Structure 1
């Protein structure tokens, strides 16, 4: 291999949540917002170079739901075993005071694809300019996910990426500080 393009989809019950995305060498090209029925390019620039009929994706998710029900029954209602995420917090760039950076909360190797991620600055939740990716597929078929918190490095701030997942008894907090 040189490259691998994967159209990954999933449907989860009872959550009734679904996802449809394209992955290139591990990076998300785009995913479909099934409610707004729009293609969400991982990098805006992508939308200027290619196109995709987001709505076509609902056909797949509809089949996936149908298949899930068939398989659910076939497995005699065997549920998924939660697999807790290993969480890592790093910066996207070397840290320098007064130089904007981004805290990256890498949530890896987990399932089911449902997680609550909160950023805490000095023990308090911070939402300012945060962003995240949808659930990215792994070759072992667990999931990866990224959460981002732009921030201005300070010797007086401490951060924590708090991750809630059914594989964990309590929220997992990954700390970061200058």
Structure 2
């Protein structure tokens, strides 16, 4: 048994939209709105298949239209923010001087707009990082990943700082080598 999901959404007034294919909870690819091209989750997939990004952008335009129609029908009911549930974990066992990856798993939140900044030591980190677009869920909340390849050491501490409108204070999740 397997499930392939074609999930798209549109959000106002931010005018943020997204189009992506999810397979058993793992993103196959997402369409980049700004560059107007298909972005595969893994590059290996691109050799075997292809997809026309124009057909994706056509559905997004409809999502904006239907969102405006549904909002007026609903008497302009707004959305109830749901704070995320952050969890920081490593990609593999932690050995000193052995390169590894740090993962920040944002989950169970809506609307799908958050701002995530890595905070190693007390100084933010911007290099080596990557992320994934918002992934769909069964309860119609969202999922997101933020990565950070780093080098473990006894005296280095990391934090994942998440900002969401459902939160009163930015949620701080900590990670440090303990032994």
Q: TM-score, normalised by structure 1?
A: 0.98
The whole-number CA distance in structure 2 between the counterparts of 1:169 and 1:57 is 36
Task: After TM superposition, give the deviation of residue 92 of structure 1 in Å.
Answer: 1.0
Task: After TM superposition, give the deviation of residue 54 of structure 1 in Å.
Answer: 1.2
Task: After TM superposition, give the deviation of residue 66 of structure 1 in Å.
Answer: 0.4
| 8 A contact 1:160–1:175 mirrored in 2 | yes
Deviation readout 1:73-118 (Å, 9 max, x if unpaired): 1110001100000000000111111111111000000000000000
Deviation readout 1:8-41 (Å, 9 max, x if unpaired): 0000000000000000000000000012111100
| 8 A contact 1:8–1:137 mirrored in 2 | yes
Task: After TM superposition, give the deviation of residue 141 of structure 1 in Å.
Answer: 0.4
Q: Does 1:153 align with 2:152?
A: yes
Give the aligned partner of residue 137 of structure 2: 138
- Residue 106 of structure 2: SS of its match in structure 1? strand
Instruction: Supply the RMSD in Å over aligned alpha carbons.
Output: 0.6
Task: After TM superposition, give the deviation of residue 124 of structure 1 in Å.
Answer: 1.0
Unaligned runs of 5+ in 2: none
Deviation readout 1:133-178 (Å, 9 max, x if unpaired): 0000011100000000000011111000000000101211110011
Q: Does 1:48 align with 2:52?
A: no
Moved over 2 A (4+): none
The whole-number CA distance in structure 2 between the counterparts of 1:168 and 1:20 is 26
Aligned length: 177
| 8 A contact 1:34–1:55 mirrored in 2 | no
- Residue 58 of structure 1: SS of its match in structure 2? helix
Deviation readout 1:50-77 (Å, 9 max, x if unpaired): 1011121111111011000011111100
Q: TM-score, normalised by structure 2?
A: 0.97
